[PDB]
Amino acid sequence: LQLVESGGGLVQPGGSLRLSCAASGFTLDDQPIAWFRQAPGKEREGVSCISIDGNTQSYSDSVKGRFTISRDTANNRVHLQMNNLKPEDTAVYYCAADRYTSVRQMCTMIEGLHRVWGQGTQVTV
Amino acid sequence: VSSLTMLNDTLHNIRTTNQALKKELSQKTLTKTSLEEIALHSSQISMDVNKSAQLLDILSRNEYPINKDARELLHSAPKEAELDGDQMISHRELWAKIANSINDINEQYLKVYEHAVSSYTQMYQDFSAVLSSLAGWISPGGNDGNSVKLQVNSLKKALEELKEKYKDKPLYPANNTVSQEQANKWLTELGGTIGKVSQKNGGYVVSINMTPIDNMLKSLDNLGGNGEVVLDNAKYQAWNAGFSAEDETMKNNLQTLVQKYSNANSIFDNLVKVLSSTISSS
């Protein structure tokens, strides 16, 4: 059972990236999904989350308006569209699954509730 | 003569509108937009029903004859319309009997389940809105990552004003009262769980069954605390499961109402088609 992120890399201010969360032996649709990020020497923080049904999305304060989270249930993937990337956003980005929650309209960015984690992909601006 | 052609056109008008309505009902998720469209189509059907009801009264009192062959077509009419053909009833009566069938099906089946679906949909939409905001009432809590803090009282009040808002909104009938025996008979033919009989002053009513929301409120009461309560993740999972279970219940109840509404469209479609055939044969 593997969570797995892609789409990272090196971009400059004002640029864009589209992160992707994919999985093996695991359907991202079965529970809420969240994106976390951690700068090299700072605390891990939540970025955004999407509900089971996909109709509910939340984003951290320092990210609203710029980012967009969506589900690709066809190919069993979650995307994070990061636009107007400001230099602060340099960090390792992880997608995680909260297996506790089962209400289909909600999602949280509480790290303690997420126990399935990917390796991470570096983003730099 | 001119009435017949007007009536036949009015009947086909009702058929197409009815089909548009059925497409709205087969949609997976009924939104506020969907309800608005359903409302419009229904008022259009009622518009043509009244138009038809007046053309049939004309044919009835003029005693326009419906010929043998044409009457036999009525045997294809749905059993709900209570139209049989021929045997012995006058032209006046049959024309009137056809008008009553159109009006009764539209009044007792279509409009009834169109209101029930509307009521339960609006409630479920507000209910789903509460569940979408559920993370706002949940916080990290304990410093080890194995707990979460729940704003039980805020979430409790949110669910209680939801109950207060639809506590009274009836499923059937939309406005009037009904005898105890009939309100029970409408509930017993619905599915028991969706609605509850309640005495609205001089008479009865089939109101929304609030048990799913009462079950959630009782799960919150059993959490204790005094505004905020710390739950370990395992207890959060158990509680959260109960909440999502009642969402499935209400989602299921709504699908049942939409099926009753859909079944009504099929009845009406079958009748209007048969009536077009009968009109065309006169």
Q: Which domain CATH number covers B277? A: 1.20.1710.10
Going by C-beta distance under 8 Å and a sequence separation of 6 or more, which residues neighbour residue B127?
B162, B213, B247, B250
Report whether B157 contacts B192 (CB < 8 A): no
Residues B216 and B218: their CA atoms lie apart, in Å, by: 5
Residue carrying structure tokens 């009244």: B50
Judge contact between B149 and B138, C-beta under 8 A: yes
Q: Which residues have C-beta within 8 Å of that of residue A15, sequence separation ≥ 6?
A: A85, A125
Q: Which residues lie closer than 8 Å to B117 by C-beta, 6 or more apart?
A: B25, B30, B38, B254, B257, B258, B261
Residue bearing tokens 């729940």: B150
Distance CA B102, CA B99 (A): 5
Q: Which residue has the tokens 């005693």?
A: B63
Judge whether B123 and B208 are in contact, CB under 8 Å. yes
Token digits of residue A117 = 């984690």
Residues whose CB is less than 8 angstroms from the CB of residue A86 and which lie 6 or more positions away in sequence, other chains included: A13, A66, A125
* E strands present in B90-200: 138-139, 147-151, 170-172, 195-199
Angle formed at CA B252 by CA A74 and CA B81, multiple of 5 degrees: 115
CA distance B115 to A15: 51
Count of the separate structural domains present in chain A:
1
Listed resolution, Å: 2.5
- B218 by Cβ neighbours in 10 Å (0-12 / 13-18 / 19+) ranks as exposed
Asked if the Cβ–Cβ distance from B135 to A108 is below 8 Å, we say: yes
Asked if B244 and A102 come within 8 Å (Cβ–Cβ), the reply is yes
User: How many helices (DSSP H) and strands (DSSP E) are in chain B?
Assistant: 9, 6
| Structural domain count, chain B | 1
Residue A42, CA atoms < 13 Å, CB-side half-sphere: 11
Strand ordering across the sheet containing A2-6: A2-6, A17-24, A77-82, A67-72
CB atoms near residue B43 (< 10 Å): 11
Note whether A106 contacts B134, CB cutoff 8 Å. Answer: yes
CA distance A31 to B274: 50
Q: What is the DSSP string of chain A?
A: -EEEEE--EE--TT--EEEEEEEES--GGGS-EEEEEE-TTS--EEEEEE-TTSS-EEE-TTTTTTEEEEEETTTTEEEEEE-S--GGG-EEEEEEE-SS---SS-----GGG--EEB--EEEE-
Q: Which of A105, A109, A114, A117 to mutate to test the interface with B (most CBs of B within 10 A)?
A: A105
The answer to whether residues A34 and A44 touch, using CB atoms and an 8 Å cutoff, is no
In the sheet that B195-199 helps form, which strands lie side by side, from edge to edge? B170-172, B204-208, B195-199
Q: How many CB atoms neighbour CB A96 within 10 A?
A: 23
Q: Range of B38's domain?
A: 1-282
Report whether A96 contacts A36 (CB < 8 A). Answer: yes
If DSSP codes are grouped into helix, strand and coil, which group holds residue B151?
A: strand
Q: How many residues does chain B have?
A: 282
- The domain of A26 spans 1-125
Q: Rounded CA gap, B187 and B185, in Å?
A: 5
| Technique used by the depositors | X-ray
Cis peptide before B173 (omega within 30 of 0): yes
DSSP at B261: H
Nearest to B260 by CA among B170, B179, B172, B177: B172
Axis crossing angle, helix B211-221 with helix B152-166, rounded to the nearest 10: 160
Give residues with Cβ within 8 angstroms of B44, minimum separation 6.
Answer: B17
For residue A104, what is the nearest residue in chain B, using CA coordinates? B244
**Residues A93, A98, A99, A103, Cα dihedral to 10°:** -140
Fill in the amino acid letter for B280: S
CB contact under 8 A, B240 and A102: yes
Three-class SS of residue B252? Answer: helix
CA angle, residues B184, B187, B188, in degrees to nearest 5: 80
Cα–Cα distance measured from residue B153 to residue B138, given in angstroms and rounded to the nearest whole number: 12
Angstroms from B274 CA to nearest CA on chain A: 42
Q: Per the structure block, which two tokens stand in for A97?
A: 């699954």
CB B248 within 8 A of CB B4: no
Q: In chain A, which residues have their Cβ closer than 8 Å to the Cβ of B147?
A: 112
Per-residue DSSP letters for B166-185? HSS-EEESSSS-B-HHHHHH
Residue B199 forms beta bridges with which residues? Answer: B204
- CA closest to A107 among chain B residues: B135
Nearest in space to B198 (alpha carbons), one of B166, B221, B229? B166
Between CA B254 and CA A71 the distance in angstroms is 26
